[PDB]
Every structure is written in structure tokens, then in C-alpha cells.
Amino acid sequence: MSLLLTIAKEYKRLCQDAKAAQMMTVGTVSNYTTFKKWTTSRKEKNPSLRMRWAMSSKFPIIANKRMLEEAQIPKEHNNVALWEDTEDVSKRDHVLASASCINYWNFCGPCVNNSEVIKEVYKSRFGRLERRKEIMWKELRFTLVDRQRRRVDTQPVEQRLRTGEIKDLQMWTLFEDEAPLASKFILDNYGLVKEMRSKFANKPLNKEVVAHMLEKQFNPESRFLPVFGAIRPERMELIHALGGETWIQEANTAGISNVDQRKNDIRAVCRKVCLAANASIMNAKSKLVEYIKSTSMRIGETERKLEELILETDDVSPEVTLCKSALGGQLGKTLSFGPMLLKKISGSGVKVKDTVYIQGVRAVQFEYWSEQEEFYGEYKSATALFSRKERSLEWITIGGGINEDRKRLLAMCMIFCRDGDYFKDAPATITMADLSTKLGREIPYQYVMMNWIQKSEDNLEALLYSRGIVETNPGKMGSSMGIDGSKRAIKSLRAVTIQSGKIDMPESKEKIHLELSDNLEAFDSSGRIVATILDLPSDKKVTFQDVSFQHPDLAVLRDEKTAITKGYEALIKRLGTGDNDIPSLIAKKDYLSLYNLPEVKLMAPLIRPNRKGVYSRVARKLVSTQVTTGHYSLHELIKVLPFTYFAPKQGMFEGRLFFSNDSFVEPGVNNNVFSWSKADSSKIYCHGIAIRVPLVVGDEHMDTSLALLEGFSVCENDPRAPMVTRQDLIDVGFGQKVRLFVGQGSVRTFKRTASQRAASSDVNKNVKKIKM
Amino acid sequence: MDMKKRIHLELRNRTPSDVKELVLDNCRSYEGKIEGLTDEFEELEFLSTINVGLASVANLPKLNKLKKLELSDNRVSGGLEVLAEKCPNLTHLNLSGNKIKDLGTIEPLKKLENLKSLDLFNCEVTNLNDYRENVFKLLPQLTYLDGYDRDDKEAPDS
Amino acid sequence: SKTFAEIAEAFLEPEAVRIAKEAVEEYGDHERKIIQIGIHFQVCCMFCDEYLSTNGSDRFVLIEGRKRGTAVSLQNELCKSYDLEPLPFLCDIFDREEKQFVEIGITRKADDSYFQSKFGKLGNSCKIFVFSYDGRLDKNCEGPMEEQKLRIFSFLATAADFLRKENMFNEIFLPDNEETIIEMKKGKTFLELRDESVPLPFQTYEQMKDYCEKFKGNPRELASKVSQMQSNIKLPIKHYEQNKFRQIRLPKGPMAPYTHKFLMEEAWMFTKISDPERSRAGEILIDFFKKGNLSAIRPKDKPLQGKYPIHYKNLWNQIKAAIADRTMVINENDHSEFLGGIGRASKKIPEISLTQDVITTEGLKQSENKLPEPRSFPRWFNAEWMWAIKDSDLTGWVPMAEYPPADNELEDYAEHLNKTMEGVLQGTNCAREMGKCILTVGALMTECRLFPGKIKVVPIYARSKERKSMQEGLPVPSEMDCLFGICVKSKSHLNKDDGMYTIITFEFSIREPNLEKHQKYTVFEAGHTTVREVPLYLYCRTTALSKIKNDWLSKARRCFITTMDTVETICLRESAKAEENLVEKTLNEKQMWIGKKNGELIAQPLREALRVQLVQQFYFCIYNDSQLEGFCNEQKKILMALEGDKKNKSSFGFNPEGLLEKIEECLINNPMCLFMAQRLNELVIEASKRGAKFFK
Amino acid sequence: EFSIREPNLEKHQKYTVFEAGHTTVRMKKGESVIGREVPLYLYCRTTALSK
Amino acid sequence: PMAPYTHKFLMEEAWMFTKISDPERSRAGEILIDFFKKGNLSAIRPKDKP
RNA sequence: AGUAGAAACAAGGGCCUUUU
């Protein structure tokens, strides 16, 4: 308004100068950032002394002037000085104010209607508070603690994201007029944005603070700390008040934040799909990728794509690793040999060949690495630090707390190093059948011996006996391990050391881009294997909740419900741009041409034939009623259209529309067959399966011009077309052009025509036509 | 969205003096307060405001030709005195889905001598004893209540 | 991040990434070009779009991703089959419905230069399409299909936004054909220098580069030089057991006198009851003035010791007068001017205005710094240390905040222990000195901030609370304001940190002085005071301070933290070894050696030894200097050697004599260093009865 | 337990309450049945018992 | 303060879903599962803040 | 006078730079 005119006058005055003009004319807008640093640069060494000296004065702060005049803030109440007309050297528009002035405002001053929005701004810390309040403390005890050092997360966070996925989110919720082009993360996560937008809209707020708080709300604070007991963010956030080196304040904190359940579900799904793709013989790679992209799952309220969560988590499991490898997702340098965990500290080497005779004379190749290399190893409640040297386990130290876990870790380590005579001459018990190739897929002798151990405890005992045994020398009695896993004995194993106190887990902030084979075995720029499908449980049955396996092979429904779902899908795919589609017809109010679509003609056979006319009447009625005015709900037409194909008739409609399979849908209420919500207006739930509706038009429920972006696209710039805003963008015609401003210092030309095709397929298929 | 944009959109270049109907359902109004309404709307005879986070009806301007109103899905409570002065020619009213506790809040509606039908559903008042009868004895001019007259006579379509 | 490939993987398909990677490896070019190529390749892909011809067959055939030889083979095969002319150069894609190759280009500059160069190079042989990241197109034929264009421009827009966000939208990553050679603009002078900073045997950076890029390892010469250097060195190794540590040689001379600004043991104070209304320093100094004792004082012109007694006497009279005037202010006279160093700041003399005659007139030699002089061991330090361990007849000397609520056993334990320790410590004498310093320094800092360039009057006081007797008698003991003396500042124009503002100290005592200890003071005989009547003395001196010492003295509540840490650590360690609450027992039972008497060792529970550590920390806070810093930094070696001796660890060293020298170098005219050094000698002596590695 | 009636602070003190979406109510309309959607509440409470 | 509700269940403020009774499934474990099948319970998703 | 250190202060610019 008048303020706008003042801004224009100021811009004019500033351009009248020469230097300001040169700088606002030369270069791009990014220079602003640079200019933001050359100004207001001043620091202090010990702000503490300076603060005390400074606050001692009688008007130590600065403050706005007009805000005080408007706030009718006087210069005294009962004789205490509150501010004095004057000018700071830096701001030039601020006045020196007293500490007493702040107190004055809070006690009696300018009241505001409401302030509960704060609870949303700092939601993380109110969550901390609530989690604390729901704890039941317990006694306090004194003792020594085995605190192991390791990298963990201290901030419980749902839907952990990246940074590039945030810099955009902070705009569509706060600064939409200055928003950039729509990124994929937005189009995919629409309901999330809508939620974050519903709260911080039409409110008096400082927005920079909100953005900072949102960054914290989406940042898992990763720290390298000493830890004891279970590992959960709910605890690490207050570990300081649970136990130290000499004391422990017992307390139960198991039933809060429901975090690890999501991770175990994810890993179960990963295992399932990995096995599924393994069922194949030549395309398990593409099969797995398809299973991935053909799947989704629910998190709290929202539905997220699997491949998106997989690239955000950090669960180092032999399942997640494979998936993240297929999708080209980089990851850390962490190994996996069966259930155990491993990490290399130093050393090097290279592959080498050797052979062993299974029964009598049966040569079988097995490989082993060359020079000395250190490794840390982590099994359940047990740690170890060992060294391998030319097909032998040189030394090892342990700091666990259990005998069974100790023995299992030791055995798996011995295997990992091919130490012993068994790798020189396998036992009679094993045979060529147990060797490999369940159905053709070979197996290295390593995992063979692995399962041979997991089969019987006596195999493990014999394997341990393969390691040298001697008499426990004096003094080393404490640092010795028997066959049962006892901290001391009269005779103990060879080259072993024990101790109380776990080993400090190493650390490295490194990333690597690995690959995998057609047999589901990943490689890392070397012949080393980081993961496989033999190091995971064999199989198990589970009933996954709030998941969407939208793939034929990964489906249990029959042809009837599947046909209904596919008919709905096809009917939705006509929700794009261009004439002959439902949006253009709605705009033209041609409610009749919808009845003659081909998709309804393909879904008609599924309708109950003895009452198809009556239902048809009702459906057409609703459609006209919604179309003639303009007050329609897109989630009801897509539901009732399949019935408008036949001819109306007479009869009593009793509230429900039945198909030929004794499954109905009701016009207005959500059911198992067709459900949706105003929260997530971009999804349709049919028989549990989810369907993503494109964003071409926005009906009464949808919000803020974020529901038209999938209908627009970029085109060659045309200076003839007009320039408009982001709100009038809805009044354009399908197929028209218009110029527009995007983000900052950028103008482009858009056209309301979509392009459903992506680049994956086009790149993937075209690359397959070149390897011939 | 927002009642302002909704209104400006419904007004497809039409003056706010020749319309006979308006609808603003599935919108939002800051502080549950009307925004964009004036006395300019004179020929308006119908209104529909549903699920807009409304809480009070103080701001609504003077509308005489109005003869039907809908305020369901909101959380209005207490302000029914404003309806008499602003809209004295009203006949049909609906409040199902709002915060209504006692009858003292309903008493002002007696002055709407032009009132014929009222709709109270899902409110606390309905959970009382002798509520239909006591209401009828309070508002005698009224004939229909939630779609049913005395003796439970179902009302016609329209 | 961490590599261009991972970056490209952000908005590209990893397949095209690997493709462009293999390509750059083929041509062996800089791997920074992975991006452009991948983009071009992906464009080609999305340009095919799996379109088809009338015959239900593919319409377009990619030739860009294939090897060069294979690509040319296919090009010639197609030029022959369809009977087309062979092109001189290679292309990217070929179509069948038109039977003419097609070339794709890309650029960032909004100009035709790239399209003009390409059209000159190829004329009109085939179809060329160059797109722009900012929505432009230049070609030599009819436009492409509507879906290739709407799809190609969108991808390029996204990519350009990403790059601009990554600051890589420049010629470096997106060069044209020509600007493909980026290199540091090596000038002339830089090269002239580089060929001059080379080591001796080489004379040009080229020789050094050729010697380093081809350097091979010869372990034998390395080992030979190692042994040679190992023979001409003869590094001494000295096991402490054989070569013991002599005692430390303290300096010799007079004794180190009192240095702290305020008196602690010899201090006398007048007390009154505190009213909450009158609580500022300028008010209490008057309240104590009305009763007449502060005015009853009247020193004489004959001092027991000191200098300039007339100035001190006149200053005291002026102080009394100003107090009577209800204005804590003083006028600038000759006396104050002399005591405050008002005009004794040097006068400047520029050299431009200088001459030899001026120098010869008055010698202007370089200032001969007169470093401090040595001292001897003080015999009055143990007295103060023993006096600062006893109660003071009151408590609450040091203000402290409140205790918050508690919900779990942990906070209960913490509060209990903290209450015990605070109640034990608040009753000592060191505590009242800490509170005195706190409050006096706060007042002085406030004054220096508000009333510079003006001589003021500030009291030396403190606040406390009489101890709590049983419920019998008068309950709810009262508070008390105590006054030990008067203080005065002098124009603290603290233009800069580390500055100095002279002050003056008028204190009250009832104990005659000693020349060795109270050397700087100038005492006067004032009169008598009650308790019966006893004589009175007036200790007076001069000193200065700064911002830093003020801020730190005001922050003198860290000793509590250190002591609590030590004690809680000991108790928790003793409690964990047995897995039981052993805290009260450890405080009441565990004995801590605290001194010698009659040649025997003395011990008292920790509950009473806390006071020693507290006084130690307070003195560290008071006498802190560079000397004490160096000392406390160089004494750790001795303690580690001692510990090694206790555990039969055969320690050793290279040159302990130098360590002793370094230590004894920083022992000068600072009582704390001398005291602690003598005590360390006594420690090693007493331990020699139980340990080796020390000489007598 | 399920309910369609918001609580009062006094009578409902031992109860923890939530809001679980909406539901439907069904009533006669001439010769047919209809359904009118309403909110839905969830009443949570703990208590003991014996044989 | 006023005396609060004490009984275990709710009498007047209650609510109930309905369904037809099958004599072949006249047990709690079966009735509950059947009520759950139609998915009206799964729709019950209480928000975080009470 | 004094401070402290291995050099600096003991105002500097043209009138300016009070509550445990």
C-alpha cells in the first residue's frame, strides 16, 4: 500500500546514486549474500566482562522507536527512566532503552489475543518434556559401569530428511510467493506440506525463527558418546540423568516414541523383497527394483515411498545395504558376516586361491586375503578386536559379558579368517548336497561352515577345539578363556585375551559408492563382500500393517478386487490435461460426455446387473448436481462414475452401490473399498491399496495452488504471453501459455500441459539397446 | 482456503447487489470471525457457511431479504441475539454441529416471528429430558424441529 | 558429495553417470566433465522417448553412448544400407522416418554463438538442435515433437537450478568447445620466485618435480644416515632411581610481605543490623557514621611506620568531611593528586622536534627495565592459613541462590551433599574475605563505570547472619552488616582492558604491625574501642586494579565447585568399589593427612580437610600471576615421578636439572610459590622415608 | 470405550480422552434410512478388579 | 470437589457399533475379529494430543 | 608513589568518550 509506494520512492532515491545503481545492476542477485557480510561486522573477546560493564549503565540496550510510540510506552510510571530520544551509530533508526523498559511491557503493556502457536514452533522440546513426564523413576544405586563409546542419535525425529529437502519445505509453508519450481519431494509429500502450512498460516510470527526451529525438528543430533544399556534416542537425550561412571538412577522408559518398530518393520520388508527377487535366476536385480518402486508404507498419518525412506535411514543391516546398493545409494564402510558386525581398522591385502577336500578327495576352491589386517567385531552384548594374517587368526581380545555370545563371536571370527584345519580338510559330516546350489546358486565354504555351526553346538565345540589349547600360565589366569567361555581356568585356548569392559567402537565419516552382482553379493572396489543374502535369517511369516504392495507377484487379492482397483486406476489416469479428459469437461460443464468414457465402459461388467439402472440414475444425478454449480468433490465422481454407463430406471435406492462380487461403495462415507481424507487429498485407498491422484485441478478441499503444479510445465519463452501471479494461475485454459516469476530473480514461461513420462524408463530402456 | 478469496471467486464480476444465494463451505475464517461481508448484499436470500472454524456471529452485517441460513460443523456458542437485529425476516435456521449447552442461549430466537424450521443435531441440548416439548413451549411460532413437527410429522422435500 | 559422481547422482540416473564415467576414462579427461556428458546422454535418451514408425518399429537409434570405433562402424553401416552420404564427423542420434542423422547441443549463454559455430562446422548436412537452460532453442530445420520439447526444457531447468545452488553453474563444469582448458594463470614474478625458493641441490622447480615424481625408496642409505645421526648425538637416559632429584634452591634476601589488597587476619570490623530498605554501599557507610565510632577516630601525626603520613591524614579528614556532606566525593588537591598519581604520566616528545643538543641536555637513553627483585620464605603464611580454617562467629558470608525442587533420589542426594558442604564452608573466615572481595569489587566496578574522572569513596564491607542457637532464647537469628574499612578510587578512565586505576585502602585493626610483613602499609595510632577497651590501629596503603581482576574476584565462587568436585569424586569412587552408600562414612571417617607437628604427622576427616583445599583455591585466585602459572605447570613432572615411585614403575628422564632450573626461575617475590615449593621439598623428604628417586 | 459426547472435567477425571476421526448415525426418513456423520471420541481409563 | 464417575463402563455417554449375530461365531474372539474385518476400527486413529 | 612484566599503564581526542 502506501508502504509499497514508500518502498518504490526509496528504490528510486537509491538508484539516483551511481554506486548503488552499479551494484544493483551488475551481477546476479546472489551478490546480496556477499553484501550481507561486509556490513555489521563487530565481535568481542570476553562478552561476559563486556556484558557486565555494559548493563551497569542506565540505558544499556537499543530498541525501535516507532514501536514504542505506537505502543504508547511513556518515559516513566512512578519515577524510573524507560528510554530517551537518541540514535545508535549503526542502525540510525534505533534509540537507547533501559532494562526496566522490558519489565514494564510484560507486567502491563500491549496484550495479544493468543500465543499457543509456540507449542508448535518448539514441538521437539515440548515432546522432550512430555516424554519426561511419562517416566516412572526408580531407586538409585552405586557401582561401576561399562560405558562403551559409539556414534548414536540423541534427538527422536519422525520422517528424517536431508537438507535439500528442507530448504524447499521452509518456503512452501512460509514464503510461497517467493517459492521456486516444484521439486519432486513436494509433489510426493503433499499432505505433509499442507499440514505444516495449516498451522503457520494467517498468524503474526517471526518466520526466520520458525525456519530454524523446523531445521531442528528435522535434524537427528548425531554424537559420539559413552553409552550403557539399551540404545534409544528417548534415553540418549537425558542420559546425563540416568547413570555415570559410578552411579545409576534406574527408570523404565520402554513404552515411548515407538521408534525401533518402524526400523524392524522396514528391515522385515527389505528381507521379504530380497527373498522374492532371489526367487528369480536372471533378473533379480530389476525384479527387486520393481518391487521397491511398486511399494509404499505408512508412517503415522502419511504414506511414504519405500525407496525414499531407505535413502534416509542408517540401519547397517545386510538387507538395507542391498537395497541402498540397487538404488545407487552411497553408504558407510561397514561389513556384515552373518549376524555379527565388523569394521576394518587398518591393513590391506588381496584375494588368493586355495582348495579343500570335502570327503576323501573332492577339491573345492575357497579364497582368503594376504597381508595382516586389524578388525573390530560386534555380536550381541559382545565386542572383540582381532587380527588376521595369511589365512590365520593372529590375535584377538574380547570385552563382552556372556559366555555363549563370546564363543559364537570367536567362532564366526575364526571362520571370517579361514583359520584352522577344517578349511584345509573339511569334515566328513558335510557332503556335496550341503555344499551349495539349493537350485544352482553356489555357496562359498565360509557360509557352509556357518550354517554347519548354527546347526549343532557340537560342531561349534569341535571348531573351537581346532584352535590351539594349552595350560593357563600363571598370572594370565584372569586373561584366559576356556571352552565354555569362563574368564579363567587351568587350561585355556591359544592366543586369546579377555577383559571386563567393552571396546570403544571406531568412527569414520566416510562414504562409498558400491555395486552388486546378479547373485545379490555387493562389492566395494575390490573382491571383498560387504553383504549378501546368506547372512540373513532363512525365512519367516509376518503380517505387515499399513503397507501397499502394489505389484502382481507381491499381491494376495483375487482377480475381482484387483480388476476393480485397476479400473479405478485407469479411470484416474484420465485426470490429466487435454480435452477428452474430465477436467476440461467439468470446466465446460459437459457432464454427459463423462458417461460415454471407455473406462466406465470397461468397469461396467462388474456392476450388479439387476440394479445397474437405478444406481446409474443416482450417479448421474449427483454428477449433474456437482457439475452445474462448480461445488464438487473430486473424490466422489471418481467413485460413482462407473455406474453412469447404463440407462436410468425406477426403483428404491437403499444407500449402497454393489458390484458383482458383493462389495459395495457408499456415496459420502469412506469404507474398506474406497476411502480418503481431507488431510491427504492426494491419495485414494481401495482394498487397502493406495493410489496417487495427479495434481491438475483443485476442488473445495485442496489448498493454496499446490494442486495445479502437475498440470503445468515449462516451455520455450514467449514475451507475448502475459505475466500473472500464482493465484490467478487457476483461471488459465488447458494448453495455454503464460509468463511468470519464480523464486527470486528469475522469470520463465509455463504451459498448462503435463508430461506423465519420467526419465528412469527412458534412460534404462535406451541403455539396454546399446549393449547389443 | 480463505473466505475472502472464496467470495471474490464466487463473485464472477457480479455486483454484490444482484445475487440471491451464496455458499462458503469448506473455507477458513481467522479467529472464527466473518471476513468480507457487508450490507452491500441486499437481494441475497440464502446463505451456507459450514466447517469454516467459526466460533461467533457478531460481525455479520444487516441482511433483510435473507430467509435461510446454515452454520453447521462450526463451534458457535452464545451469540443468537445478533441474528434478531441483523436478519428479522429469517425462516429456516440450522446449527447442528455447534457448541450449545442450555436453553437460555436459544431464548432470543423467539423474537424471530418469521421462524418456521430449526435444526439441532449432535448438540448437548438434545441429551436433556423433555427437550422437544420444552423447546416447543419456548418457541411456539415454530413448527418443524430437526425435520419433524409435533407428532413426528416428517417434513416434505421443499 | 566428496566426488563429482556422487553429485551427478543427485539429479541424474546412475546409469548415465557410469556411462559418462567410462567415457571420460576412455578419453582419459578430467573427471570434472562427468556432468555435461551425462546430461547430453540423458537428453538423447529422453529424446528417443521409445517413439515408433509406421512399421511398428523403433524410429530413432542412439549413437552417442557407444564407443567411438563402434559408433563410426554403425554410422557407416547406416549411411550404406539406407544409401546415404557418409558424414565427416560423428553424430549422436539417427532417425529412420527421415533418414538423416541429428546432432544435439547444449549451452548456458543466451546467444547463438554455439549454434553459429556448429552451423559453420556442419553447414546444413544434418539436423542440429541446441537448447538453453533458460528456455531457448536454435535449430536448422523444423522443430521437434511437442513432448520432447516440454520434457527436455523441464529437465534442463531443474538441473540448472541445482547447479546454481551448488555454485557449479559456470564455465568450469559447463564449458563450451573452446573453453575446455582451465589452468592457473602462471605469471612471471611467481615463477621467478618459485625457481628461487628451491632447495640447494636443485635450481629450478622442474628438477625438483622430476626428482620427487620419480623418487624411489632406498632403505639402506636411510638406515645408515639414521645410525650416523644416532651416533653423533648420544642422547642421555637417566633412570630417576640412580639419578635422584635434589632439593629446590629458594632465593635469598628479605621476606615476601603481604600483597593482597585487603587484610584477612589482622582485620577489625564494626557490625550493625541490616535493614532491607537501606542496602546500597553509600547508605550503610553513613549509618555506621552516625553512631559516632567512625567519627570517634582521630589519628595522630606520628606514624609507627610508613611514609607520606601527612597525605594519608589529610585524606582521612577529607573522607570524614565528605561522608558528613552525604556526598561520597572528594576534591582534587595536592595531597590526593600525589596519592592518586593524577599528573605523574609521562610527557611526549616527538623526534621530528628532536635534536642532538636536546639529547645531550637531558639524557634520553633507552629505559633500563628494573625487573623485580628476589625475596625469602615468608613465615607468616602458615598463620594466615591456620586462621582461615576456623569459624568466624557467623555464617552466610557468601551469598548463594536457592535449591530447586526434586523428584528422584539423585536430586535428593545432590541437594543433601551440597547443603552439608555449604553449611560447613559458610562459617569459616576465608568465606567472609570472599564475600568482602565480591561486594567491594562490585561496588568499585559500578563506580568506575558510572563516575570516572572523579574521586569517590567506597566502603569495605560485607553481609552475614548470626549463627542459629537452639529454639531457646531469641529465635529467628538476625542479619548483620559488617564494615572493615574504607576504600577510595582515582579516575578509573579504563580506556582499554589491562589498564590501571589507583585506589587507596583505609582498614581497621587492633594488632600492631611487623616490619617484614606489613612493609607497604603506613600505620597510625587512632585510639580505643570496645569489645572492654583496647587500643586501635589504622593500616593504610596504596594499590591499583583493572577490569580483569575485578571481574575475576567478583567471580570467586568457583572454589566451591572445585572442592565439591574433588570430594564427590572421592566419595563416589569409595562407594562404587563396595556397591553401597558410603558417603557420610567417608566424610566422617576417611582421614586426610593435613600437616606436621612435633615432627609427627597430623590427620583429620575429609569433612574438616575441605577447608584446606578451599583456601588453596582462594589463594590461587588471589595471588595468580605468571610466576605461579609457570610453577604449577612445571611441578606436575615431579608428581608423576612420585606416583611412578609409589608403584615401582622404573621412571626415567633426559635432563632433570634443567627442569629444576626452569622451576626455580619463576620463584620471585610471590609468597605462594615459595610456600608451595618449600612444602613440596618437605613432601619429597617425608616420602624418601618410603620412596626412592629423591636426594636429601 | 467409544463415545459421541465430549466430556466434562469434573465427572470425567479418571478418564483420558482422545478424538478418533468421525463415525455415522442412522435414522429413519419416511420409508428409507439415512445416515448423518458425527465426530467420535475415545475414553481411556485404567482400573483394577478381583475374583 | 465433586465426586467423579466411578463405574468401570459408560452408561449414558456410551456408543456401540452393531452387526448381525451368527450362531456359528457366537464368541468374543470371533465377534471382535468380525467387527474388525470391515475396517471400521482401523479407521480409529486417535491424534497425539488429548 | 604504585601495578605488572620480561612491556605497558599511570586518560585520550578535538567540549566530548550508582540499592544482594
Side-chain angles (χ1 to χ4, degrees), chain C residues 70-83:
Chain C
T70 301
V72 175
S73 73
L74 305 200
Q75 177 179 343
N76 303 21
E77 170 176 353
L78 303 203
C79 80
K80 183 180 180 182
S81 159
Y82 291 67
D83 183 288

Side-chain angles (χ1 to χ4, degrees), chain C residues 357-410:
Chain C
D357 183 328
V358 171
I359 298 162
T360 59
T361 300
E362 181 196 279
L364 303 189
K365 302 178 301 313
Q366 180 181 7
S367 159
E368 305 296 339
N369 54 358
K370 296 184 177 183
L371 80 181
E373 56 280 16
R375 282 286 172 278
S376 176
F377 179 88
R379 315 182 185 284
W380 49 265
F381 207 84
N382 186 34
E384 293 284 348
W385 204 305
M386 295 166 58
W387 162 92
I389 293 284
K390 310 180 298 192
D391 305 336
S392 64
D393 183 278
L394 296 94
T395 169
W397 288 100
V398 167
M400 293 292 290
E402 66 283 9
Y403 297 90
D407 54 64
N408 47 22
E409 303 177 342
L410 183 67

Side-chain angles (χ1 to χ4, degrees), chain E residues 6 19 24 45:
Chain E
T6 296
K19 96 186 183 60
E24 294 176 350
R45 302 179 173 277

Side-chain angles (χ1 to χ4, degrees), chain A residues 536-567:
Chain A
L536 46 81
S538 183
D539 183 288
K540 184 177 179 180
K541 293 179 179 179
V542 169
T543 59
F544 304 82
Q545 267 189 344
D546 293 358
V547 198
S548 84
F549 306 81
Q550 53 182 336
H551 182 274
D553 304 4
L554 312 184
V556 304
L557 277 44
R558 310 296 84 241
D559 193 358
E560 311 181 357
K561 306 181 176 181
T562 310
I564 295 176
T565 304
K566 293 180 298 193

Side-chain angles (χ1 to χ4, degrees), chain A residues 132 140 142 757-758 769, chain C residues 49 66 135 151 407 409 581:
Chain A
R132 184 192 180 285
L140 172 55
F142 296 91
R757 296 169 64 92
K769 293 179 179 179
Chain C
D49 273 358
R66 287 174 176 83
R151 283 191 73 217
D407 54 64
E409 303 177 342
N581 292 338

Side-chain angles (χ1 to χ4, degrees), chain A residues 453-470:
Chain A
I453 290 302
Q454 303 177 14
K455 189 185 303 311
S456 149
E457 168 273 1
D458 203 48
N459 306 319
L460 161 57
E461 300 293 352
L463 175 50
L464 295 175
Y465 268 87
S466 171
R467 190 71 168 180
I469 302 92
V470 311

Side-chain angles (χ1 to χ4, degrees), chain B residues 6 12 16 22 25 32 47 49-50 55-56 68 71 74-75 79 104 107 124 126 134 139 141-142 150:
Chain B
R6 185 85 172 197
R12 296 282 68 195
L22 184 59
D25 305 0
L47 182 58
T49 59
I50 311 182
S56 62
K68 188 157 182 60
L71 311 174
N74 296 274
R75 54 177 162 276
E107 182 174 359
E124 295 301 321
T126 62
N134 193 30
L139 311 190
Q141 67 285 38
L142 191 72
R150 301 177 182 80

